[PDB]
Amino acid sequence: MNYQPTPEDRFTFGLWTVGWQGRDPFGDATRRALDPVESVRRLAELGAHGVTFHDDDLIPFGSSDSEREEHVKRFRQALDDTGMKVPMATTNLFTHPVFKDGGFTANDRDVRRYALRKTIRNIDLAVELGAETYVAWGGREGAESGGAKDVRDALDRMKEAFDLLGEYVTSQGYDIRFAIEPKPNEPRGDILLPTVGHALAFIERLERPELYGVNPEVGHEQMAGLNFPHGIAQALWAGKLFHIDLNGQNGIKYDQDLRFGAGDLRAAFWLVDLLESAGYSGPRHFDFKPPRTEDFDGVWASAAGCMRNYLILKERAAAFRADPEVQEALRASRLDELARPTAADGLQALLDDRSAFEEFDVDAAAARGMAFERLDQLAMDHLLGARG
Amino acid sequence: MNYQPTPEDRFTFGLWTVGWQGRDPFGDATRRALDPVESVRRLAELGAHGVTFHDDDLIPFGSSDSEREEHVKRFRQALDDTGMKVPMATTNLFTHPVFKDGGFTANDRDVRRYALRKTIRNIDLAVELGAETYVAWGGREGAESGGAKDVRDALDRMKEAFDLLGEYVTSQGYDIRFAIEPKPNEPRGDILLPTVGHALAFIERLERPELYGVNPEVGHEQMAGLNFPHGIAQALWAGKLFHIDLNGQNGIKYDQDLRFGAGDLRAAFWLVDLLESAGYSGPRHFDFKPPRTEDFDGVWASAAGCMRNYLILKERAAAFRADPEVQEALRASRLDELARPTAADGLQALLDDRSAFEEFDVDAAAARGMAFERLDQLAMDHLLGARG
Amino acid sequence: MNYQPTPEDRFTFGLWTVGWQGRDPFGDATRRALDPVESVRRLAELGAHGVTFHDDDLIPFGSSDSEREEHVKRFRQALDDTGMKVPMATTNLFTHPVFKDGGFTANDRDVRRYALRKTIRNIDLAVELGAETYVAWGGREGAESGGAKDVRDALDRMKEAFDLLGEYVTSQGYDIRFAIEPKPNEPRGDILLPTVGHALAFIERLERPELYGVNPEVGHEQMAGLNFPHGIAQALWAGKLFHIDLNGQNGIKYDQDLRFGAGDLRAAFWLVDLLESAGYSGPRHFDFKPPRTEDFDGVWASAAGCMRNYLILKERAAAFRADPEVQEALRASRLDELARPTAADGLQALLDDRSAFEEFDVDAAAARGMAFERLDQLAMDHLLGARG
Amino acid sequence: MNYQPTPEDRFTFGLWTVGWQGRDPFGDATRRALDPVESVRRLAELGAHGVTFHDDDLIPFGSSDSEREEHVKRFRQALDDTGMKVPMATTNLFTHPVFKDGGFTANDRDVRRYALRKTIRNIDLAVELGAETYVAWGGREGAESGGAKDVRDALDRMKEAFDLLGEYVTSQGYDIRFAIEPKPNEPRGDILLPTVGHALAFIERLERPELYGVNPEVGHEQMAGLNFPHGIAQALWAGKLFHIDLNGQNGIKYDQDLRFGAGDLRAAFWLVDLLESAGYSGPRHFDFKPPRTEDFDGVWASAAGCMRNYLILKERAAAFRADPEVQEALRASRLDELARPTAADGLQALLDDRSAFEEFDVDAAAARGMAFERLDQLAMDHLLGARG
Ligand SMILES: OC[C@H]1O[C@H](O)[C@H](O)[C@@H](O)[C@@H]1O
Ligand SMILES: OC[C@H]1O[C@H](O)[C@H](O)[C@@H](O)[C@@H]1O
Ligand SMILES: OC[C@H]1O[C@H](O)[C@H](O)[C@@H](O)[C@@H]1O
Ligand SMILES: OC[C@H]1O[C@H](O)[C@H](O)[C@@H](O)[C@@H]1O
């Protein structure tokens, strides 16, 4: 009867989430900047396992090698004081005006080289802090108009960039993998590699595909009206779910980054059911923005809400799968048959099987109800805790 | 000053397009059925190069081997009489009630085996008629609720199915490739392999990836709010654009299948520019539905409109790229630099290049305007034929 | 601990809902036609209060005055046998090919006159069966292309039609009101009066506005990405919520008509909370389609699910509002202040109030957190039955 | 053969459009602030008729009565030097953190009173500068979660606010009307009065409805997937199109504010055709944002592009309507009949007209094609300048 998170739950937060000051396209900040050290302390008290960062969240852009050292030192001391881990790090290749046309796929060659150098420097830092995953979100890679970007040339530049980071990591002997985070649009009119599918496809064209996977975000796939759990299943099927960003989103519109559980509640249930049943072992990272209507107390309530909502859904999904009535319904809907090979007997035997065509009774097969509605209502009852 | 199509333009139409009777989810047919032989004659007169078909368009479901022979014979004679070709064929694995839960990924194993046998039979027919591409549109593969389909098991069944068709084609020595046509939703709540990206990713997991590519449709990618030309560029970059379905769609809503040129006009311009500049050599296939408000005369006007709109855009795109002012603008926006390697000098030289980081002037770089708006207005002027 | 519906709950269903045969734009029917008398019996056993119908659901198109009489007689006897009521009726001005360009706004004048006569005949029938509300869903009023419909002239024809039905009802002394059901698109490219707002605005231009209100549908407003509860609040505020259609919809895509509770679960919670708190006293009508994957047993399970889901949400919303912790949170977020007039003191006093401008401390006001996230998590806890 | 705008064309721009510095939710400004006086000079040279402003664009928030006077004086002198007019003004009730929960519908009563006082002060300024229209865009009126805002109470507060501004304007004897600008979402999760329809409906509940109309924006209606020209026709039909915001938007996603003509090109054509045929006489105001990739030269090219694109479409629409072949097609599609009353003979005569029902030949009527596709292709040919 308790939903208290503990570090063993592997809940993580970006510094930029609880640290979001509330500046939006139409308004000024509503909260003061949070010292990352304070963020780490508050999060550890809430039961979090660790934090993530962009280089620019930790070390202000333009810091001298000296101030940099100082900023890392204070951070490192907060991690030691709290026991918090840093499992993932990423680069800010979107805020500074130089990246207005992108980082790895900017038309200007000198900016692409700078983007790489900036990233490489942060990869060194990430390894030192113990991160296992390095995320790349190409927020500025894309266009508002068609002639501004030749997409085939942009994809060559993107592959070139990732191949170089792969050569770097391998030459240094680092134990770290990359994860590409898709987003369909915003802040560019259209962004390259807009969905999980596009990113997965792109990865197979890299020189060392085994080094790269995806970091899908609930809200981003939903901005394209796609089914998030289905996209995650395809990533898992491919062996490419290296990390995940959890949050909420209310349909096709701007990127909301609501707390996890908010937005599409049923999709959140099916997502938890899948992550737990597939045995996803990575961090449960929250990339959310406490709404700008909130003061600091609302910020911490929002973060606690993300973890609470995950734990409640995990309990409901587990009760759903453990329910014998549900196991019976799953067999009535033939989920058991879906998992059996269609033709382990082989092509030849299938061609010779008259029961597969010549003598197949299509009419009888057609008449068989799938019983999906009863199964779905059983799932609803479990979610709402209304199971008899 | 003429936009008359000729067979050399490679325009093709599905029998189900001009033959659509007008039955929609809320109303009865508004037109009588068209005899495929008549469809072939009318289309040849309009300047079309050929037609495509689903098995069930040509041979009514349940035909005896005898009537089948008769139907193919009459069709074949119309093709000989007109010189029309059949470059693509596909299977109907969606109309009959047996496929209500899918064909290759139905939960019922007996239906999956039947779907394969039905497909294999039509592949034999396709080769005989000279088709080079066999399209697969999994319209019924998917779900309306989360527990009805374990997506990892469904993907195993889908791969199993495609691998078997690949074994079949290779064992028979057929010269024919497969093309997967994505669609995000409708008629299922969510469809598997919902976008070009998801289909491309899936293909890399097949046993003989070289046999499969995609058959993207303008309207389907737009039902997910995605940029069609960008998706096509990624397919071309991957060497997987085996075929394409051209039509129009007005945003995120039901699958409209408006005539090509209708819907998002600018995207149609950028798509034509890309297909012609990349030297796409396959058919320009139209998968459209003449609206049910039309009589047969409106059906033929609609089909002629598809071809006319492609020819007009082709002329405008070619004039755009040939314009010296445009070539000058493209250099001002650094499209030339986008096409140059970021670091052909190699990783080591990039790491040692102080001009790439230590001494890079971010401020100067940032201040450089991209000149994208002038370029885009030049494109607009060309499209509207308002170029001085 | 029980969610059994009873006729006092005022749950109603259209004959076309449980009677949907499963024909969609890409497939044939998967279920046989249901005799309306059977539908009435099954629904009464489930705990329903009554049914609704389009003329064509009850009396097949083209029936002789004789067969018509017979069909009404059998229906009437089923209502007497079960105690079921008929609180609403409507016209089918969309299925028959004549209505391909609309009914009240068809370009052909002779069809508009026929649409009116067909409607008037059914209004007489509705009154006789005791219906209090007559719904109008202009599914075919609209266009796929811009020049096909002059919208100002179409609105004149629509107003003319409604004004005539108003004159008819008033001249006959009937006790019956009209309700306009909006839908943004499908089966037309764009439909006239696409949302609740457009319909409300249109009503104020009718000759006797007091005779007309709206019949909003959950899924239709969601097809435009709008907030359904907000739209319902505006209808209630205007005194125009005469009836309502409950169902589920998963975002911006084709009209799904999933069972109530499916789709956006949180919106369903907030909708129930609003209907119950505002004391909506009309029918709780379900306009849903049991998915075509189901057999008759799944049809009845789906219908029972609609009612169950409403009763569960009603219990959760009532517990939310009754919770003292929630009442405390509502005051912390100043919902109490929202309900107080901004300036009951009047314009002059506001202009002279220095505390309203000259001496207003914007900074202090700005710093006040709204506490919305804690309130929302309290709502989530109540919905999931996880309230301590 | 010329598309040069002149002040007689009535093209206007907001100071915040060409003055947009490029700050977005993910990045810093890419351009320096423009002095409003400079903006006025550059725009007059481009052929603009005038400018619009929010109070805070002209007078920086918190200015002393003294600096205010100075800022107005410099502005006024630029208008005199150039002959530029100021036909519309509006209030910034969204940037400052105090308005984080709204202005007129903030839960805090003290903020609602402040919002009114701030608005009233700017109305006085607007009249002095000669503005005929005062626009209200409630960007912060709304919510991210359901319990945060009781929408019926919010609508009472909104009506109360507008009624007070109406009392103020009437008591001062000012010649100025209000225009409500709808937007469905962003920066709030859902905004109140989300579409043209909702705003029109709301206006009929105000004390003096004749004082208020709408200021629809192309992109905002498109963020809800609605047909902009249709929404504008309904506004014109109601006599409520007081002003309009022109721009471009690519579908359902964040508010792009692309230059007019960009986005949905065909909708822009149909919009121009409607404004010119209905004789809309108000300003053609552009609310756009030159993309942040641009430098100042791209800013001015973008603004010139807005005007050019309107003039080109105006020429094409006029040629379309003047074409005798098009006038012939319009009669073939029965646009002439749409404009004729359905029953000027009256209810009684319609009831007695057997040709309207008893003897109506539905089959013959049904068989009549609408000829909409040929008409639409004629429109396309005209738009692309491909008319023989
Ligand atoms: O990839 C690193 C992070 O960068 C930015 O914060 C993006 O907004 C976020 O979605 C992404 O997760
Ligand atoms: O793939 C074959 C064809 O099957 C159906 O006709 C689909 O509606 C169409 O989009 C697809 O192209
Ligand atoms: O208005 C009567 C009914 O007609 C049709 O069944 C529409 O699909 C439904 O949404 C509407 O409620
Ligand atoms: O209403 C005044 C203006 O305020 C803001 O600039 C909005 O972003 C814009 O859409 C609106 O037109």
Which amino acid, residue A243?
H
Helix (H, G, I), strand (E, B) or coil at B241: strand
Proximal ligand: closest to the CA of A14? 1
Which atom of ligand 2 is the closest one to the Cα of B90? 2
Tell me the DSSP string of C286-351. Answer: E-----TT--HHHHHHHHHHHHHHHHHHHHHHHHHHH-HHHHHHHHHTTHHHHTS-S-TT-HHHHH
| Tokens 């100043």 found at | C334
Q: Judge: D293–A223 Cβ closer than 8 Å, yes or no.
A: no
Q: How many CB atoms lie within 10 A of CB B368?
A: 18
CA angle A20, A25, A31 (to 5 degrees): 30
D195 closest CA partner among D212, D178, D219:
D219
Which of B90, B185, B196, B285 maximizes ligand 2 atoms within 8 Å of its Cβ, making it the mutation to test the pocket? B90
Nearest to A154 among B204, B338, B379 (CB): B338
Q: Are B113 and A356 in contact (CB under 8 A)?
A: yes
Tell me the torsion sign for CA atoms C217, C222, C224, C225.
positive
CA angle B365, B370, B373 (to 5 degrees): 160
Q: How far apart are CA C307 and CA C12, in angstroms?
A: 9
Which amino acid, residue C88?
M
Q: Are A13 and A285 in contact (CB under 8 A)?
A: yes
A-chain residue closest to B117, CA distance: A357
Q: How far apart are CA A111 and CA A101, in angstroms?
A: 9
Q: Are D53 and D89 in contact (CB under 8 A)?
A: yes
Q: Are C47 and C87 in contact (CB under 8 A)?
A: no
E-strand ranges in chain A read: 11-14, 50-54, 85-90, 133-136, 142-143, 177-180, 190-191, 212-214, 245-246, 284-286
Nearest to B384 among D296, D302, D385 (CB): D385
- Is residue C387 within 8 angstroms of chain B, CB to CB? no
Nearest to B337 among A109, A202, A266 (CB): A109
Residues of D serving a catalytic function are 54, 57
Here the tokens at position B266 are 């600018």
Which of D91, D95, D227 to probe the C interface (max C CBs under 10 A)? D227
- Is residue C254 within 8 angstroms of chain D, CB to CB? no
Q: What Å distances lie between residue D102 and A292, A382, C235, D108, D148, CA to CA? A: 12, 38, 22, 9, 12
CA angle D144, D146, D152 (to 5 degrees): 110
Q: Judge: A293–D148 Cβ closer than 8 Å, yes or no.
A: yes
Atom 2 of ligand 3, nearest CA residue: C137
Q: How far apart are CA A259 and CA A274, in angstroms?
A: 19
Q: How far apart are CA C237 and CA B304, in angstroms?
A: 51
Write down which chains contact chain A via at least 3 CB pairs under 8 A: B, C, D
Q: How many CB atoms lie within 10 A of CB D381?
A: 22
| Tokens 């890309």 found at | B274
Which amino acid, residue C55?
D
Chain C residues near residue A265 by CB distance under 8 angstroms: 265-266, 383
Nearest to C94 among B27, B252, B291 (CB): B27
Cβ neighbours of residue B48 closer than 8 Å, sequence gap 6 or more: B5, B7, B11, B12, B13, B84, B303, B307
Strands C177-180 and A177-180: unpaired
C350 closest CA partner among D112, D96, D102, D122:
D112
Tell me the DSSP string of B362-383. Answer: HHHHHH----HHHHHHHHHHHH
Here the tokens at position D168 are 């103020």
Q: Judge: C380–A298 Cβ closer than 8 Å, yes or no.
A: no
Proximal ligand: closest to the CA of C119? 3
Q: Are C53 and C40 in contact (CB under 8 A)?
A: no
Which of A287, A288, A289 maximizes ligand 1 atoms within 8 Å of its Cβ, making it the mutation to test the pocket? A287
- Is residue D266 within 8 angstroms of chain C, CB to CB? yes
Here the tokens at position B371 are 């000149």
Q: Are A114 and A154 in contact (CB under 8 A)?
A: no
List the domain range (segments joined by +) for residue D259. Answer: 1-388
Q: Is any atom of ligand 4 closer than 6 Å to the C-beta of D255?
A: no
- Is residue D300 within 8 angstroms of chain B, CB to CB? no
Looking at CA atoms only, how far is residue B377 from chain D in angstroms? Answer: 7
D13 closest CA partner among D254, D228, D232, D310:
D310
Choice among B49, B55, B56, B57 that is catalytic: B57
DSSP D35: P
Cβ neighbours of residue C360 closer than 8 Å, sequence gap 6 or more: D110, D113, D114, D117
D376 closest CA partner among B248, B40, C185:
B248
Q: How far apart are CA C248 and CA C269, in angstroms?
A: 12
CATH number at residue C338: 3.20.20.150
Beta bridge partners of C89: C53, C134
Q: D residues 154-213 near A, CB within 8 Å?
A: 184-187, 189-190
For chain A, the first-to-last Cα distance in angstroms comes to: 17
B377 closest CA partner among D294, D305, D48:
D305
How many CA atoms lie less than 13 Å away from B238 in the CB half-sphere?
A: 30
Which are the residues after which chain B is interrupted (C to N > 2.5 Å)?
none
Beta bridge partners of C284: C11
Which amino acid, residue D205?
R
Which atom of ligand 3 is the closest one to the Cα of C257? 10
Q: How many CB atoms lie within 10 A of CB A79?
A: 18
Which alpha helices (DSSP H) does B173-295 contain, by range? 196-203, 218-222, 228-237, 265-277
Is residue D287 part of an annotated ligand binding site? Answer: yes
**What totals of helices (H) and strands (E) does chain A contain, helices first?**
16, 10
Which alpha helices (DSSP H) does D249-371 contain, by range? 265-277, 296-322, 324-332, 335-338, 347-352, 362-367
Q: Is any atom of ligand 4 closer than 6 Å to the C-beta of D287?
A: yes
Chain D residues near residue C100 by CB distance under 8 angstroms: 366, 370
Measured in whole angstroms, how far is the alpha carbon of residue A382 from the centre of its chain? 26
Q: Are A236 and A281 in contact (CB under 8 A)?
A: no
Proximal ligand: closest to the CA of A288? 1
B127 closest CA partner among B64, B191, B175, B56:
B175
Q: Are B193 and B155 in contact (CB under 8 A)?
A: no
A93 closest CA partner among A83, A106, A108:
A106
Chain A residues near residue C369 by CB distance under 8 angstroms: 293-298
Tell me the DSSP string of D82-101. Answer: HT-EEEEEE---SSSGGGGG
Q: Are A321 and A50 in contact (CB under 8 A)?
A: no
Q: Residue A340, exposed/middle/buried by CB under 10 A (0-12, 13-18, 19+)?
A: middle
Chain B residues near residue D184 by CB distance under 8 angstroms: none
- Experimental approach was X-ray
D319 closest CA partner among D222, D225, D246, D388:
D388
Ligand 1 — pocket residues by CB below 6 A? A 16, 90, 135, 137, 139, 181, 217, 245, 287
Q: For residue D25, is the peptide bond before it cis, meaning its omega torsion is within 30 degrees of 0?
A: no
Q: Is any atom of ligand 4 closer than 6 Å to the C-beta of D135?
A: yes
Write down which chains contact chain D via at least 3 CB pairs under 8 A: A, B, C
Which alpha helices (DSSP H) does chain C contain, by range? 15-18, 36-46, 55-58, 65-82, 109-128, 151-172, 196-203, 218-222, 228-237, 265-277, 296-322, 324-332, 335-338, 347-352, 362-367, 372-383
Q: How far apart are CA D260 and CA C202, in angstroms?
A: 29
Helix (H, G, I), strand (E, B) or coil at B141: coil
Question: Resolution of this PDB entry, in A?
Answer: 2.0
Looking at CA atoms only, how far is residue B297 from chain A in angstroms? Answer: 36
Proximal ligand: closest to the CA of C220? 3
DSSP D8: G
DSSP D136: E
Chain B residues near residue D386 by CB distance under 8 angstroms: 3, 312, 385
- How many structural domains compose chain A? 1
Annotation says B153 is catalytic: no
Q: How far apart are CA D305 and CA D261, in angstroms?
A: 8
A-chain residue closest to D248, CA distance: A144
Here the tokens at position B72 are 């193919």
Phi, psi of A53 (to 5 degrees): -155, 160
Beta bridge partners of C54: C90
Beta bridge partners of D284: D11
B-chain residue closest to D316, CA distance: B384
Q: How far apart are CA D240 and CA D230, in angstroms?
A: 14
Q: Cα Rg for chain A, rounded, in angstroms?
A: 23
Q: How far apart are CA B204 and CA B193, in angstroms?
A: 13
DSSP B195: S
Q: Judge: D308–B385 Cβ closer than 8 Å, yes or no.
A: no
Q: What Å distances lie between residue B193 and A270, B142, B236, C253, CA to CA? A: 18, 9, 18, 17
Which atom of ligand 1 is the closest one to the Cα of A91? 2
Cβ neighbours of residue B271 closer than 8 Å, sequence gap 6 or more: B218, B228, B229, B232, B246
DSSP D34: P
Q: Are B164 and A343 in contact (CB under 8 A)?
A: yes
- Is residue B100 within 8 angstroms of chain C, CB to CB? yes
Q: Are D259 and D288 in contact (CB under 8 A)?
A: yes
How far is the centre of ligand 3, averaged over its atoms, from the C-alpha of C182 (Å)? Answer: 10
Beta bridge partners of C190: C143
Strands C85-90 and C50-54: parallel
Q: Cα Rg for chain D, rounded, in angstroms?
A: 23
Write down which chains contact chain B via at least 3 CB pairs under 8 A: A, C, D
| Tokens 């009802």 found at | C169
Q: How far apart are CA D362 and CA D190, in angstroms?
A: 45
Q: How far apart are CA D132 and CA D174, in angstroms?
A: 9
Here the tokens at position D280 are 């809309």
Atom 11 of ligand 4, nearest CA residue: D137
Q: How far apart are CA C387 and CA A204, in angstroms?
A: 47
